[PDB]
Scaffold this active site. Structure first.
Site, mmCIF file in Angstrom:
data_model
loop_
_atom_site.group_PDB
_atom_site.id
_atom_site.type_symbol
_atom_site.label_atom_id
_atom_site.label_comp_id
_atom_site.label_asym_id
_atom_site.label_seq_id
_atom_site.Cartn_x
_atom_site.Cartn_y
_atom_site.Cartn_z
ATOM 1 C CD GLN A 1 10.141 -0.520 -6.529
ATOM 2 O OE1 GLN A 1 10.312 -0.558 -7.732
ATOM 3 N NE2 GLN A 1 9.309 0.371 -6.075
ATOM 4 C CB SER B 1 1.462 -3.777 -2.505
ATOM 5 O OG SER B 1 0.314 -3.110 -2.962
ATOM 6 N N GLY C 1 -1.814 -7.071 -7.435
ATOM 7 C CA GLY C 1 -2.232 -8.412 -7.811
ATOM 8 C C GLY C 1 -1.292 -9.474 -7.266
ATOM 9 C CG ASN D 1 2.160 4.437 -0.462
ATOM 10 O OD1 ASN D 1 1.407 3.569 -0.854
ATOM 11 N ND2 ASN D 1 3.456 4.277 -0.535
ATOM 12 C CE1 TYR E 1 5.143 4.831 -3.922
ATOM 13 C CE2 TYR E 1 5.949 3.907 -6.018
ATOM 14 C CZ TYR E 1 4.884 4.303 -5.197
ATOM 15 O OH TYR E 1 3.611 4.164 -5.627
ATOM 16 C CG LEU F 1 9.815 -12.109 16.022
ATOM 17 C CD1 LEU F 1 10.600 -10.838 15.707
ATOM 18 C CD2 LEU F 1 10.008 -13.085 14.869
ATOM 19 C CD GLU G 1 10.145 -10.424 26.185
ATOM 20 O OE1 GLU G 1 11.134 -11.027 25.709
ATOM 21 O OE2 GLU G 1 10.254 -9.569 27.092
HETATM 22 N N1 LIG Z 1 6.251 2.991 -0.178
HETATM 23 C C1 LIG Z 1 6.188 2.350 -1.329
HETATM 24 N N2 LIG Z 1 5.010 2.039 -1.834
HETATM 25 C C2 LIG Z 1 5.085 1.357 -3.044
HETATM 26 C C3 LIG Z 1 6.273 1.055 -3.639
HETATM 27 N N3 LIG Z 1 6.042 0.380 -4.820
HETATM 28 C C4 LIG Z 1 4.723 0.287 -4.907
HETATM 29 N N4 LIG Z 1 4.084 0.854 -3.827
HETATM 30 C C5 LIG Z 1 2.645 0.843 -3.596
HETATM 31 O O1 LIG Z 1 2.099 -0.349 -4.178
HETATM 32 C C6 LIG Z 1 0.676 -0.184 -4.314
HETATM 33 C C7 LIG Z 1 0.097 -1.024 -5.477
HETATM 34 O O2 LIG Z 1 0.657 -2.332 -5.497
HETATM 35 P P1 LIG Z 1 1.560 -2.777 -6.781
HETATM 36 O O3 LIG Z 1 2.831 -1.942 -6.820
HETATM 37 O O4 LIG Z 1 0.753 -2.561 -8.068
HETATM 38 O O5 LIG Z 1 1.768 -4.250 -6.256
HETATM 39 P P2 LIG Z 1 2.184 -5.430 -7.242
HETATM 40 O O6 LIG Z 1 2.313 -6.654 -6.347
HETATM 41 O O7 LIG Z 1 3.546 -5.221 -7.920
HETATM 42 O O8 LIG Z 1 0.910 -5.585 -8.161
HETATM 43 P P3 LIG Z 1 1.019 -6.416 -9.473
HETATM 44 O O9 LIG Z 1 1.776 -5.667 -10.551
HETATM 45 O O10 LIG Z 1 -0.388 -6.602 -9.959
HETATM 46 O O11 LIG Z 1 1.663 -7.767 -9.307
HETATM 47 C C8 LIG Z 1 0.473 1.313 -4.574
HETATM 48 O O12 LIG Z 1 -0.538 1.829 -3.710
HETATM 49 C C9 LIG Z 1 1.864 1.920 -4.351
HETATM 50 O O13 LIG Z 1 1.838 3.198 -3.729
HETATM 51 C C10 LIG Z 1 7.557 1.415 -3.010
HETATM 52 O O14 LIG Z 1 8.676 1.165 -3.433
HETATM 53 N N5 LIG Z 1 7.383 2.046 -1.840
#
Ligand SMILES: Nc1nc2c(ncn2[C@@H]2O[C@H](COP(=O)(O)OP(=O)(O)OP(=O)(O)O)[C@@H](O)[C@H]2O)c(=O)[nH]1
Ligand SMILES: CC(=O)O[C@H]1C(=O)[C@@]2(C)[C@H]([C@H](OC(=O)c3ccccc3)[C@]3(O)C[C@H](OC(=O)[C@H](O)[C@@H](NC(=O)c4ccccc4)c4ccccc4)C(C)=C1C3(C)C)[C@]1(OC(C)=O)CO[C@@H]1C[C@@H]2O
Ligand SMILES: CC(=O)O[C@H]1C(=O)[C@@]2(C)[C@H]([C@H](OC(=O)c3ccccc3)[C@]3(O)C[C@H](OC(=O)[C@H](O)[C@@H](NC(=O)c4ccccc4)c4ccccc4)C(C)=C1C3(C)C)[C@]1(OC(C)=O)CO[C@@H]1C[C@@H]2O
Ligand SMILES: Nc1nc2c(ncn2[C@@H]2O[C@H](COP(=O)(O)OP(=O)(O)OP(=O)(O)O)[C@@H](O)[C@H]2O)c(=O)[nH]1
Ligand SMILES: Nc1nc2c(ncn2[C@@H]2O[C@H](COP(=O)(O)OP(=O)(O)O)[C@@H](O)[C@H]2O)c(=O)[nH]1
Ligand SMILES: Nc1nc2c(ncn2[C@@H]2O[C@H](COP(=O)(O)OP(=O)(O)O)[C@@H](O)[C@H]2O)c(=O)[nH]1
Ligand SMILES: [Mg+2]
Ligand SMILES: [Mg+2]
Lengths: 430, 426, 430, 426
Positions: free
Chosen positions: A15, A133, A137, A199, A217, A245, A247
């Site tokens: 995203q 993230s 997972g 966030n 988001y 990159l 430097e």
């Molecule tokens: N800024 C922002 N934060 C996001 C976005 N999507 C998810 N997050 C953050 O992602 C964090 C958790 O990670 P997940 O979204 O569950 O990561 P994942 O890799 O998809 O985890 P799994 O479903 O287990 O595979 C949260 O703390 C969210 O706030 C986004 O589009 N923008």
């Protein structure tokens, strides 16, 4: 020449990718179908086919289909190569061990092969840009499986890493502390510069600077993408002082393990505010040293600065920049370490920040991205290892990780290795 | 792509199920004929989660229906959506369970279960990538309690790594229709604590309390109760059927919801819920959607959460909404109510956010609470059970099916072990 | 000058023929009624009559009517001369001995009479292109009856032979191992270059490269014809480095009996991906060395290469090809024999690959057919003689062959002669 | 062009035959008058395989109709398609076979065979290239069992190299209408093992099991059983009547299907078969056709194939389908069921694929099994024969026709020799 392979892992990384690629297409003037109406400026991010279609130098990976099937159906479906978008069968369930040990094995050898089929098109691949993230997972477990492979297959190449990291209070998961602490081996051993972002800090930056009372988001991703554009702008464009990159890293990183800079951007501002203030180089430089603009909820005044990269872009001049950082050296609240008497690496690039037309962020003649190595970031680690300690004292969710092929001792070995990083950032401040 | 196999057992399980098939068919835009008639490509892009394609673009639900009487099959098949199911997935006996768990588990359903299991095998191997089993039943009476937990045992042994997710309507003192409910429920909860990955505990006393003190229905039927249950059944799978800002699979719920393996007995809820004469005066916005969702009046088991502490809550939101506002409200709740959450977990709330709210709603939340207060539901059943069992009352109907008195002693032993593990963290 | 007589035998050979002649008509701009609207490029494959009708230099032979009666009724009914579509009354029943001794014994002197009437219209006939199934009764038994005659009647002329060969797991018949082993005398004694092809390998190529999930035989035959168009392209067209049909053999065949090359084609690609891949000369060269693109299920890395013919066509330049084969010589996983220090025969032709308009295989500026003599192919023989051994140890179907005039000792004499070929390919690797 | 001569014997052979002629006339688009009324050129292209052209473009089927009683000729001639057949090809006696094999073979049919065989000559001399003989009969009773095997012997001696291909309805204990059924069959199987090139073993117990446990018919008649048989008769010749991706003549079946000369007692099946009220819920496709075709409930003989191993199976598919998908499923079956195929044959499945599926379905498959489990059909007849024969019961009706007791001893001897050759490869 000057290529950067961009890897977007799990929902957060994909995203943020869907905002990065929204931005890079506009800034280079590429249509969402991959055509270019009417110079090599696009080459860092786009391969060009003989038909005149541009194709992004990227890989999107998710172990569950939903988010990447959105990209394969929405307005960017024509842009990507339909094999560079990779979907597994089953979700990683916010469990590191599903990402790393159990589900990741069923797709890693396809992911890494598609990365290699991008690298064979480069001529001097400059580095990797890895978006994820820390709490996910797939975000933690799949990125850590992938980085371990990339660090044996591409050992020289610099791996820059953009991480959405757990907040002081805002959280989306119960097991976010477990996935983040298990990731700390990845960033320490298999990364070269790791940009933590939060966030809750961007939610506050949005409330104060953009006048948006309740952001989604898509707002956050239009700020994180704006940083990576500004890092890569010296790789893509002409400037007075272009920064490579490598430097960048020679000025950011004082010691091999001390590669966790903060990042901030200025001016983050609403288009309605931006008429009533002049936004000079001195103003936007001083904005970078406010606690109010840091994208991790920690206070830089509780630290010491080791080094700052001030990466200016748009209508800025080295006169103004030297005159600005002279006022930052004069302020006694902004404290550098005794062993960095120079402190500042300056970059200056002639291309203004692009506006995403649907965004909240003003048109401005100038911006700066400040990337900053400081001892203060150890508090964002001291928050999260205190969340970990309460749960591991009970073994509170550990059967889900042990049940999917992880050694129970890896939790102790990860909390141990985090305490050695939190030691290193306290040790060098003196 | 994350298929589900859904199973209905006894009168209650086939009634909450056959109402759920009316709800998720209205979401996916499927006509009672099985033909697709929906608005949106998002309604169709995941129809494989609950349905099979057939020729002429007819959609067949991946449901299996089980009873020991023909009369509920005749009641579902003659109903509004009764044509939509596969005729060969109706599997039934010809004499009832007699409200006897031991008839379900040892005699009349032990005969039938092999003809259930080969239909479950047909639908499961015909899936691309099964995620889990979604079983609807009741813990009172004999078909859902005793055959449904036989069927959980047989499916658990054959599919050990897939999510076993059960929706379990279960006995309470002030709303009861059976003398032997405490026996049947105690013998059945002994199977759910070992085999299921999640069990959603549902109560007719709490479903009547929502109808009287929130909906203000003057004469709520079982059809109105079945509508409240099936809204939360549609709710928890939403994130594998539709896109979202935060996706959560049933497994992504389980990893966050179940701290210690056996503490998986949840208590669902739903928002918004209003009288049809007050929907004109209320805002559906996330703060009002949250103040309702955490209200002791909104939850579908009679256990007041103020008589315990949440281990975990999951709030699965649906609709176009701010992540700041959702993350603000799930913080404000557990800081202003901090005495009602366990203080050895640093954040007790999971959030998920789907982009597609229910048809005719601008926003929804489905709530899942893992509260220690659920010890009261197992306690009061164990206290009803103890009084009948201390004098062996009605046990010739169970021991006549070849069941031991030792199995009653062992089931209530395992019931008090479940009560003790929830009380331990309280 | 430069004629080829194409003989299409049994159902597989006739159905590959119905794809070959579909292609050659498009590639030379001949209508399906044999007329040509508006250079002698067609002359290799078509005789021209004074009406302005181009008639193919082909014979179609089947012992049963069904498949050729379909050729006599479909869109090509007006292309062929009506007496060179040749049929019997009686099917060969997947029995070699019906094809060779009993049923084909009647049609053979009519098949030869057509081949004589075609050869007498040639002026410097280049060779024969013989298409068949190894598993068929007509495929094995009638081809082996015909080749024995053509090898006394036309002893000097090169006999190129395209064989659909039994797979590791995919099979359509119980007696496919018997018919294939009985054919090994034909290919050893009465053939000059024999291109084995496998249904299961093309089914996997279709799945991975065309992304067609469930292909028919029309999808296979459209790949098998495309290779023969590329073998013949230097006979038909202008090029930078045109290859004669004997120039081909002088570089492919190191020893008299070592004339069983693999074949592969690149890029096999769909219209979903052809606009995002570069398809540079380097990539389509490297694709020919992947186990993933070999049209026999054997691994080239379990062998050594003796010689490769890289037959490029379309927009390529000898600069690019030399620079490509230099990377192939650099890769230690692609191992040549010690006695072939040159390794590569290069052909380059200016005519792009023709698309069949109904087909899955996309329009592309370039193709290569790589035809490759390698020790690895002996494993496809070691598979099938282990299928033969289980059945001949029981005499499991032998009464059907002995009942139709075959000597029982021919099964031992054929398994013996196959073991001497499987010996020869192991002996030269050292 | 590969003409077939078809012969019908006794009540059963004329009834499965007179239904077969209604099925292949629907396929070839021939009217009950004998006039062509079909859609397609492919229907007319091979009409010579089963019919003679006559004046006005009327088509006359190449059947010979044989009985020792007039009443089945009267029932066929008056029937749905009775007017199609040549009046000269109805060859019949007046006094029946009495359910006696020896009346068929030595007395009543030995008189009549001189009048049958000289009609089989007129049809075989009208052929351009005869491929074989297709004989329908039953092994119970006396006309089909004893006259039909007399006629097989006479045609085998006259046409030694043409395919002799028989469809043979035969006894089983739970569905029986004759006391002397075991005798007649044991005397008849002794002729089939030596003379035929293929015999398709069919059973009324298995044809009733398809009607109740698959089609869910409440009252299946002999007309419904005759419809199941005649679908597999149309099936195996399809590849000489229509074009295909893989063509297989009856001889291309025999070379692949018969490893050792005498092991040609096949066991047919058909797919798709669906409950009449359930078709809209089923997906017609190659892996569902496979999961029906290879299951023990679908085969038309009482033998469960799980009591033996297959030698060879032939799957003759019809319809527009992928060769990868056919070759994938015929691999997956014999690898996942490898304990049910002989392991001295490296591939046990023959495939064929015709481009033209039966009128009204998108695909179809005719199954031919050769399996060591056919020992059970010959064993149970041999043990019913033995229990009567140890006490010489009923033998005066056979020895009255001048038959020896030694011929019964020699028939049951040759029956156990056929049982032993299938049990040898077990
Ligand atoms: N800024 C922002 N934060 C996001 C976005 N999507 C998810 N997050 C953050 O992602 C964090 C958790 O990670 P997940 O979204 O569950 O990561 P994942 O890799 O998809 O985890 P799994 O479903 O287990 O595979 C949260 O703390 C969210 O706030 C986004 O589009 N923008
Ligand atoms: C004008 C207007 O606002 O209409 C609302 C309405 O008045 C209210 C009272 C509805 C209404 O609900 C009830 O009347 C009801 C009665 C007994 C038990 C449960 C509900 C409504 O009927 C219910 C209906 O909900 C739906 O249609 C959802 O898609 C729902 N599915 C069904 O109810 C359904 C009904 C028939 C056939 C198939 C589906 C759903 C819920 C969860 C997940 C997926 C779908 C809605 C919005 C309304 C009416 C129509 C008045 C309420 O329900 C929902 C789920 O929104 C009850 O309190 C809420 C708040 C709404 O404001
Ligand atoms: C709308 C629809 O789906 O109609 C089907 C149908 O409902 C089903 C149930 C049909 C139907 O079959 C029977 O009712 C039946 C009853 C007793 C014994 C055998 C069949 C059908 O009658 C049979 C009929 O099949 C044919 O016509 C074939 O071509 C068949 N020939 C005949 O049955 C036939 C009937 C009258 C006169 C002449 C021929 C055939 C089979 C093999 C080889 C050649 C031809 C079909 C498709 C159907 C109906 C009409 C309901 C089924 O049969 C076939 C052969 O397809 C039974 O299971 C299949 C599945 C079908 O879906
Ligand atoms: N690629 C491809 N393979 C085919 C085709 N037709 C048949 N085959 C292969 O042919 C092999 C068996 O040979 P047959 O088709 O029986 O050859 P035949 O010469 O017609 O044999 P007879 O009928 O006995 O005369 C099988 O392994 C099939 O996969 C076709 O059009 N394309
Ligand atoms: N919500 C709901 N509860 C029901 C329904 N039918 C019965 N129940 C209640 O829950 C219990 C269900 O038991 P039942 O399903 O009759 O037992 P079974 O048929 O033997 O499994 C009954 O005692 C009722 O109080 C129904 O349609 N909906
Ligand atoms: N499928 C089928 N079986 C039949 C039919 N008529 C009789 N049969 C059965 O199979 C046996 C056939 O014997 P029959 O044909 O009467 O002896 P025949 O007239 O002397 O040859 C009978 O005992 C019946 O059980 C029929 O129309 N169809
Ligand atoms: Mg994820
Ligand atoms: Mg053939």
């Amino acid at each position: 020449m000057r290529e950067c392979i961009s890897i977007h892992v799990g929902q957060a990384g994909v995203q943020i990718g869907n905002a990065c690629w929204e931005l890079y297409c506009l800034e280079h003037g590429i249509q969402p179908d991959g055509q270019m109406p009417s110079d090599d400026s696009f080459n860092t991010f786009f391969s060009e086919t003989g038909a005149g279609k541009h194709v992004p130098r990227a890989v999107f990976v998710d172990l569950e289909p939903t988010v990447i099937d959105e990209v394969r159906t929405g307005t960017y479906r024509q842009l990507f190569h339909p094999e560079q978008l990779i979907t597994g069968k089953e979700d990683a369930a916010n469990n590191y061990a599903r990402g790393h040990y159990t589900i990741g094995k069923e797709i890693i050898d396809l992911v890494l092969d598609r990365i290699r089929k991008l690298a064979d098109q480069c001529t001097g691949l400059q580095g990797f840009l890895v978006f994820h993230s820390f709490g996910g997972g797939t975000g933690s477990g799949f990125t850590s499986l992938l980085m371990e492979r990339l660090s044996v297959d591409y050992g020289k190449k610099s791996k820059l890493e953009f991480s959405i990291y757990p907040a002081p209070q805002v959280s989306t998961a119960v097991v976010e502390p477990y996935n983040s602490i298990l990731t700390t081996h990845t960033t320490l051993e298999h990364s070269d510069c790791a940009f933590m972002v939060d966030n809750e800090a961007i939610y506050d930056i949005c409330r104060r600077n953009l006048d948006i009372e309740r952001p989604t988001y898509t707002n956050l991703n239009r700020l994180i993408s704006q940083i990576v554009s500004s890092i890569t702008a010296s790789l893509r464009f002409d400037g007075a002082l272009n920064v490579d990159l490598t430097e960048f890293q020679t000025n950011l990183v004082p010691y091999p393990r001390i590669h966790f800079p903060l990042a901030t951007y200025a001016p983050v501002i609403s288009a309605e505010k931006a008429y009533h203030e002049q936004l000079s180089v001195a103003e936007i430089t001083n904005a970078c040293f406010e606690p109010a603009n840091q994208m991790v909820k920690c206070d830089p005044r509780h630290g010491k600065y080791m080094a700052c990269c001030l990466l200016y872009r748009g209508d800025v001049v080295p006169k103004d920049v030297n005159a600005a950082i002279a006022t930052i050296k004069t302020k006694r609240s902004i404290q550098f370490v005794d062993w960095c008497p120079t402190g500042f690496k300056v970059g200056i690039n002639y291309q203004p920040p692009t506006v995403v037309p649907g965004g909240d962020l003003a048109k401005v003649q100038r911006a700066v991205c400040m990337l900053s190595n400081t001892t203060a970031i150890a508090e964002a680690w001291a928050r999260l290892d205190h969340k970990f300690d309460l749960m591991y004292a009970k073994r509170a969710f550990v059967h889900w990780y042990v049940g999917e092929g992880m050694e129970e001792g890896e939790f102790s070995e990860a909390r141990e290795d985090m305490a050695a990083l939190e030691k290193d950032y306290e040790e060098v401040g003196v | 792509m994350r298929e589900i196999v859904h199973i209905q057992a006894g009168q209650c399980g086939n009634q909450i199920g056959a109402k759920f098939w009316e709800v998720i068919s209205d979401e996916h835009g499927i006509d009672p004929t099985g033909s697709y008639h929906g608005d949106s490509d998002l309604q169709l892009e995941r129809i494989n989660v609950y349905y099979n394609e057939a020729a002429g673009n007819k959609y067949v639900p991946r449901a299996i229906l089980v009873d020991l009487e023909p009369g509920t099959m005749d009641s579902v098949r003659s109903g509004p959506f009764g044509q939509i199911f596969r005729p060969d997935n109706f599997v039934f006996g010809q004499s009832g369970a007699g409200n006897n768990w031991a008839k379900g588990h040892y005699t009349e359903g032990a005969e039938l279960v092999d003809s259930v299991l080969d239909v479950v095998r047909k639908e499961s191997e015909s899936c691309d990538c099964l995620q889990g089993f979604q079983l609807t039943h009741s813990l009172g009476g004999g078909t859902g309690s005793g055959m449904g937990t036989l069927l959980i045992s047989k499916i658990r042994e054959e599919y050990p790594d897939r999510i076993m997710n059960t929706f379990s309507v279960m006995p309470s003192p002030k709303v009861s229709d059976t003398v032997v409910e405490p026996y049947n429920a105690t013998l059945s909860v002994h199977q759910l604590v070992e085999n299921t990955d999640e069990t959603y505990s549902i109560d007719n006393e709490a479903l009547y309390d929502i109808c009287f003190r929130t909906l203000k229905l003057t004469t709520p039927t079982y059809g109105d109760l079945n509508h409240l249950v099936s809204a939360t059944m549609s709710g928890v799978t939403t994130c594998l059927r539709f896109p979202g800002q935060l996706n959560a699979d049933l497994r992504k719920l389980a990893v966050n919801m179940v701290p210690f393996p056996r503490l998986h007995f949840f208590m669902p809820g739903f928002a918004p819920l209003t009288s049809r004469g007050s929907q004109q005066y209320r805002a559906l916005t996330v703060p009002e959607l949250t103040q309702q969702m955490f209200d002791s009046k909104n939850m579908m088991a009679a256990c007041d959460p103020r008589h315990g502490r949440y281990l975990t809550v999951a709030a699965i939101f649906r609709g176009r909404m701010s992540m700041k506002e959702v993350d603000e409200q799930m913080l404000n709740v557990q800081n202003k109510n901090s005495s009602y959450f366990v203080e050895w977990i640093p954040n007790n709330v999971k959030t998920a956010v789907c982009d597609i709210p229910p048809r005719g709603l601008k926003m929804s939340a489905t709530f899942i609470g893992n509260s220690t207060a659920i010890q009261e539901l197992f306690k009061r059943i164990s206290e009803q059970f103890t009084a009948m069992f201390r004098r062996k009352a009605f046990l010739h109907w169970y021991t006549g099916e070849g069941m031991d008195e030792m199995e009653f002693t062992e089931a209530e032993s395992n019931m008090n072990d479940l009560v003790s593990e929830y009380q331990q963290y309280q």
